[PDB]
């Protein structure tokens, strides 16, 4: 008798970037999974350990479509080792979100991280801005020459490959 | 498509201040860096110092440190310097840049694409 | 800091002829030597970067060439949009580094 808000979850305004999540707890809600099982807006609707006719964290962002297949256990690249590592029982659901996030000119309030210092822990959220060091020199507050700022932002628009679509993630976690 | 628009000519004499600014389009305001650089007329050209707004601290060349103060506003996407303490040898025109960066593999390259128009100080 | 060395300091040269310009550091750099141009009255644009590649879409004007240390811009073939000034940065340090600048002059 008492829905919590997915759609708060799902329906959102704006999405997260990867590096900079948004952590939302579910408690106390009617486990309705039928709305997002029979919804057609969704594509990805991978079940990990759960029936998804049976099936809370529910960590939301944004994503390019490459990188898609990262948000899973047993996964490596740019997002699954130094963005968001996953290691679980619950579900990872996606949608295509081009008609919302791809801008004209280019969307670029997207960022991700891509030099690390070492792999992400499960659920390890770095939200620092802390200079990539290289490995030759420290950096002592230098610009990138053989020393990285740790994030490349991602713009998304309205041309593009399937792999350049944005993608709007949420893992809902059990 | 991060064009700069810049402010036009100051002429307040030494011994006071100058402050000039860059509005950016496009977007990714937060990263990459903005940089300021400077040429007297005659193209002596050099970098003064420049802030990359997602850490906020700057860096500065030795030549306007304790004269020169670079930060950025990122509600209103705008770059900006102010230089304290004015002298006539600081008449120079002064540029904004980007520092656009590409990165691949482990290596980053970097050069400036979206340049402003250029403010001209001439505080005599 | 890093000494960038520019050279020669004047270029004269014909519509349709070759110009060759040497920026040097006394620094090895692998790459990231850039080319700009300044045209009167303008703020710089970019030609060159990361040693050889084209960022202005200019129909292969200007190419160039060599690692580290070194490096050379040759222009293909000059043109009248051509005369401006031209110098050269290696992004490698705060403060980044530019060389003196040269010119490109006509008969």
């Known amino acids: 008798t008492n829905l919590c808000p997915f759609g708060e979850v799902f329906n959102a305004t704006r999405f997260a970037s990867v590096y900079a999540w948004n952590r939302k707890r579910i408690s106390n809600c009617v486990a309705d999974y039928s709305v997002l099982y029979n919804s057609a807006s969704f594509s990805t609707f991978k079940c990990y350990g759960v029936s998804p006719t049976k099936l809370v964290y529910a960590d939301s962002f944004v994503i390019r479509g490459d990188e898609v297949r990262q948000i899973a256990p047993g996964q490596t690249g740019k997002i699954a080792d130094y963005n968001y590592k996953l290691p679980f029982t619950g579900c990872v659901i996606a949608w295509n979100s081009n008609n919302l996030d791809s801008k004209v000119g280019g969307n670029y309030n997207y960022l991700y991280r891509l030099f690390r210092k070492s792999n992400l822990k499960p659920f390890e959220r770095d939200i620092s801005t802390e200079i990539y060091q290289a490995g030759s020199t420290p950096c002592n507050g230098v610009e990138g020459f053989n020393c990285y700022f740790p994030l490349q932002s991602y713009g998304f628009q309205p041309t593009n490959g399937v792999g350049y679509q944005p993608y709007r993630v949420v893992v809902l976690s059990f | 498509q991060v064009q700069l628009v810049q402010s036009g000519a100051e002429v307040k004499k030494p011994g006071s201040s100058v402050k000039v600014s860059c509005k950016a389009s496009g977007g990714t305001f937060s990263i990459y860096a903005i940089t300021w650089v400077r040429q007297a007329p005659g193209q002596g050209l050099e970098w003064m110092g420049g802030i990359i707004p997602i850490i906020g601290t700057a860096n500065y060349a030795q030549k306007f440190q304790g004269r020169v103060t670079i930060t950025a506003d990122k509600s209103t996407s705008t770059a900006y310097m102010e230089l304290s303490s004015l002298r006539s040898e600081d008449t120079a025109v002064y540029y904004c840049?980007?520092?656009?960066?590409?990165?691949?593999?482990?290596?980053?390259?970097?050069?400036?694409?979206?340049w402003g128009q250029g403010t001209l100080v001439t505080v005599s | 800091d890093i000494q960038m060395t520019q050279s020669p300091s004047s270029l004269s040269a014909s519509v349709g002829d070759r110009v060759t310009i040497t920026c040097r550091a006394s620094q090895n750099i692998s790459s990231y030597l850039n080319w700009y141009q300044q045209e009167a009255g303008k703020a710089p644009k970019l030609l060159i970067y990361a040693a050889s590649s084209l960022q202005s879409g200019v129909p292969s004007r200007f190419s160039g060439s060599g690692s580290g240390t070194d490096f050379t811009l040759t222009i293909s073939s000059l043109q009248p949009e051509d005369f401006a000034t031209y110098y050269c940065?290696?992004?490698?340090?705060?403060?980044?580094?530019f060389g003196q600048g040269t010119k490109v002059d006509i008969k």
């Open positions: 840049a980007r520092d656009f960066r590409y990165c691949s593999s482990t290596r980053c390259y970097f050069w400036f694409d979206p």
């Open positions: 940065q290696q992004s490698y340090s705060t403060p980044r580094t």
